[PDB]
């Protein structure tokens, strides 16, 4: 027995489009799983999965180059060079209207759940982008599978993410089978021995290289199983769909 809260038409601008070194565009499912665990921390409603779809999404720039951001002189000790233009590190920006659907388990009324999600989203930040606007979130429940599809079709219109898996690698199949690659998680390289320059000193830290899976965009109504669009934190330091690989 499943419960969901849907925030439709989440207009967000200033999204850090740099998903990884080789992916620029839509934020991956690690971003929205991070947003889900962020509310698990601030609001206390513990979130299993998030199904996110893109209503609108434009990467700022041309069709072959992204619009770089005019950097500001914010480091310490480079005064004197501040009159000249700051050097640009690559961070593409994008705008996106999203539709989010969080699997939550809740025991109180739907009004306080909607208010808690609204108070989170008013202080949230989708992929480094300020949430410009969002409709009032609404609670829908998936008692059975037809009710699961009711929740699924309540995200209309949006293009959700379905996992199609890795055959050999990322570049090969992106040309061959023409699917989109995105960060489904990370791979740990080395333990980090210096916790002085970090957010926490006690949380263990690892250098990571983003693993990618290959995904497709399908409209939420054309997705047969809603579990193939709900991304959640898998126990391989990755994220994964509940329904597995989309067929």
């Amino acid at each position: 027995m499943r419960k969901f809260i849907i925030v439709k038409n989440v207009k967000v601008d200033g999204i850090n489009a740099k998903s990884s070194d080789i992916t620029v565009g839509m934020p991956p499912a690690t971003t929205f799983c991070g947003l889900g665990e962020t509310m698990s921390i601030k609001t206390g409603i513990v979130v299993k999965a998030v199904s996110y779809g893109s209503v609108k999404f434009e990467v700022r720039g041309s069709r072959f180059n992204t619009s770089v951001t005019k950097f500001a002189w914010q480091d310490r000790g480079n005064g004197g060079k501040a009159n000249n233009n700051s050097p640009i590190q690559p961070k593409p920006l994008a705008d996106g209207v999203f539709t989010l659907c969080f699997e939550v388990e809740w025991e109180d009324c739907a009004e306080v759940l909607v208010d808690k999600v609204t108070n989170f989203i008013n202080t949230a930040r989708i992929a480094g982008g300020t949430i410009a606007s969002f409709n009032k979130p609404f609670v829908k429940v998936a008692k059975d599978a037809e009710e699961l599809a009711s929740v699924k079709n309540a995200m209309m219109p949006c293009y959700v993410v379905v996992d199609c898996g890795v055959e050999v690698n990322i570049f090969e199949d992106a040309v061959n089978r023409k699917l989109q690659p995105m960060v489904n998680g990370y791979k740990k390289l080395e333990k980090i021995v210096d916790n002085k320059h970090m957010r926490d000193k006690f949380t263990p830290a690892y250098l990571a290289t983003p693993t990618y899976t290959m995904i497709g965009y399908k409209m939420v109504s054309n997705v047969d199983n809603f579990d193939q669009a709900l991304w959640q934190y898998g126990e391989n330091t990755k994220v994964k769909t509940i329904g597995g690989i989309y067929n």
């Binding site: 027995m1 009324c109 739907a110 609670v139 429940v141």
Partner: protein, 93 residues
């Protein structure tokens, strides 16, 4: 006259027990029609205090008092069916 209606999806998802569902039955489930004359709707006179009404209320309340010890020994299924019978007899009367 009519049963309360619960619009809440989480409440419809989770509520199972007798009181634990009944605590979710609010005034907004059909009773609260429009709500602009609430203060006149809750200023009340007490002209019921008569002979036969008070003795009837006392004898029935003490009847309940004497029998409610078997009510807690019932199961959920019993409570639901017994209260359905009580509601049916109440609309009948």
């Amino acid at each position: 006259h009519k049963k309360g209606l619960v619009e809440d999806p989480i409440y419809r998802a989770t509520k199972t027990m007798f009181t634990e569902t009944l605590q979710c039955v609010n005034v907004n489930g059909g009773w609260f029609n429009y709500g602009d004359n609430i203060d006149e709707c809750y200023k009340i006179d007490t002209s019921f205090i008569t002979d036969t009404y008070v003795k009837q209320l006392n004898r029935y309340r003490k009847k309940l008092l004497a029998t409610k010890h078997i009510w807690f020994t019932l199961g959920e299924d019993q409570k639901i069916a017994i209260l359905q019978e009580c509601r049916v007899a109440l609309m009948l009367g």
